[PDB]
DNA sequence: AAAAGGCCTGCAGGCAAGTGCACAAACAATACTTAAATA
């Protein structure tokens, strides 16, 4: 470690060999790098915590690879995990309790973001999410705290996680003739969520 | 085998494309009125 800091450009060092496969868009990688490091936090004590980790999207169309992006990255964080939009069902991303006969307890089959905790949840086709599931990650701005209160359990399972998302506009490619957040059909109470947005 | 939690798809939630068009006013010159020139 000593031996990288002393290498010099540590950072834009890192925001270089990040993605080392592909060349361009460096800034987006700039971001994929403030997101993997994150590490910032306020318990503030006695009080409100405030989650200090990174929720960043994109934007564009199957030729910025993005998918690409995210592969890259969730092999490159620690314990990330990857999916898409329309993978997993509501219940199947946030969590599926079963509330065991045998000691008649609480057990949790890996929600993907439960799974997710302490990692990076990388996420493709965004847009198609079936916005009635896009409560469960609009919790997740709410970070590490995911209530669940049906079938006879009503409890919590707290999920330290960032959230990586890749969208596209609705009309396709894109929209020249309509203003941004058209495009974006992303209710604005998403994006605000969201910390970095990267239209491409 | 059916009744009770949960989640998937048929009905339509809806509205801009858009043409008809039924409102209006001068409209272009109607129809007729009234002063003048000639026997
Ligand atoms: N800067 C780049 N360097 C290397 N390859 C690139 C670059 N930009 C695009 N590509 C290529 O673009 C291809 C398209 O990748 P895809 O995963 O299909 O795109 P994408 O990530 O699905 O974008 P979305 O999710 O459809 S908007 C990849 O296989 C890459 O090889």
Do not use: W
């Amino acid at each position: 470690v000593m031996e990288l800091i002393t290498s010099g450009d540590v950072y834009n060092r890192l925001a270089k060999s990040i993605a080392p496969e592909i060349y361009g868009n460096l800034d987006v990688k700039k971001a994929l790098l403030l997101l993997l490091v994150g590490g910032v936090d306020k318990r503030v004590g006695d009080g409100m915590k405030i989650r200090g980790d990174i929720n960043v999207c994109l934007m564009g169309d199957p030729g910025v690879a993005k998918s690409q992006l995210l592969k890259a990255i969730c092999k490159i964080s620690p314990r990330g995990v990857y999916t898409t939009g329309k993978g997993s069902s509501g219940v199947g991303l946030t969590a599926a309790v079963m509330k065991d006969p045998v000691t008649d307890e609480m057990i949790l089959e890996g929600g993907a973001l439960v799974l997710a905790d302490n990692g990076i949840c990388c996420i493709d086709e965004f847009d198609k999410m079936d916005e009635s599931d896009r409560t469960a990650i609009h919790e997740v701005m709410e970070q590490q705290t995911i209530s669940i209160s049906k079938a006879g359990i009503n409890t919590t399972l707290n999920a330290r996680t960032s959230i990586l998302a890749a969208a596209n506009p609705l009309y396709g490619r894109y929209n020249p003739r309509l203003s941004p957040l058209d495009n974006i059909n992303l209710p604005a109470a998403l994006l605000s969520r969201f910390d970095i947005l990267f239209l491409m």
